[PDB]
From a paper:
The determined crystal structures of 9a and 10a in complex with JAK3 confirmed the predicted hinge interaction pattern and covalent modification of C909.
We hypothesized that the 1H-pyrrolo[2,3-b]pyridine (7-azaindole) core in 9a might adopt an inverted binding orientation when compared to 5a,b or common 7H-pyrrolo[2,3-d]pyrimidine derived JAK inhibitors like 4 with two hydrogen bonds between the 7-azaindole and the backbone of L905. As expected, the 7-azaindole core in both compounds was anchored to the hinge region via two hydrogen bonds with the L905 backbone NH and carbonyl oxygen atom, respectively. This screening revealed that the compounds strongly inhibited BMX and TXK with no or less significant binding to other kinases at 200 nM.
Numbering used by the authors: 813 to 891, 897 to 1038, 1046 to 1103
The structure:
Amino acid sequence: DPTIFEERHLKYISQLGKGNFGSVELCRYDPLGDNTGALVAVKQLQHSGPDQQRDFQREIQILKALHSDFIVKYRGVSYSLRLVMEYLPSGCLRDFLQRHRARLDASRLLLYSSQICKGMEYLGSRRCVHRALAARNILVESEAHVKIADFGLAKLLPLDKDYYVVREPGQSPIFWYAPESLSDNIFSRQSDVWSFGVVLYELFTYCDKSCSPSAEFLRMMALSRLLELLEEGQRLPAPPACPAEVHELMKLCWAPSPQDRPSFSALGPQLDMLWSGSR
Ligand SMILES: *CCC(=O)Nc1cccc(-c2c[nH]c3ncccc23)c1
Ligand SMILES: NC(=O)Nc1ccccc1
């Protein structure tokens, strides 16, 4: 098995991020001990109950089974249990957009949109719901290439259903979630499409803090209140210089009824042809 990384050869470098039940660390897999080894990102749990340990075992199996240019690559595990992934050096898309705004044009955002869409299309085809999709957990491999990451809330669909219900949703951020998620804790590939709409909003505002989803809710008046806005048909406003056709795609992603939202398969070509027509 080349899929097993020895604890002793994973050299801690620094922390990339920390949740409440887990963290990701930049490490060097340095078996030769000369610091020529490759950088990897390593996820582990802290203060984890047995429930979280099982979830993490599933998460590892899910990520491992996904083979897409647009999904963060599984490399292996270390055995206590640690998930080893490729390191994507440019970090999360949210911060990247803020930092490099000036050198990213509409074309580039469409490229990212298209990559994320393909990624989500691929997920759907493995009957996986991501749920957490947002600019803060999409990663940047390069200026020309993003990938979906953070499968901490990802779940495979029941084999007899196209959605699932979660019993306790925790204290996750509400501004990316579809109404059926907010009202009944329902999640599906069609709720993912809603979330993708919010990601398009993020991309095309370059994740400016003053018009973030959370900022725009506060202006436009917690869980009960947002849900009421959405049922009334209120949506995030068109980003300042957003191409009309992108804004329209967002609004479709945010259809009240899950069955009226476009599929990722239908979004893909529409985004790709806006790219051709912009560049
Ligand atoms: C945008 C802030 C944030 O939460 N970024 C973040 C958190 C945790 C991990 C990463 C990161 C950066 N490069 C990586 N490569 C692979 C896996 C995770 C990872 C970024
Ligand atoms: N999808 C969408 O428009 N949601 C929303 C609406 C108002 C405030 C925050 C988020």
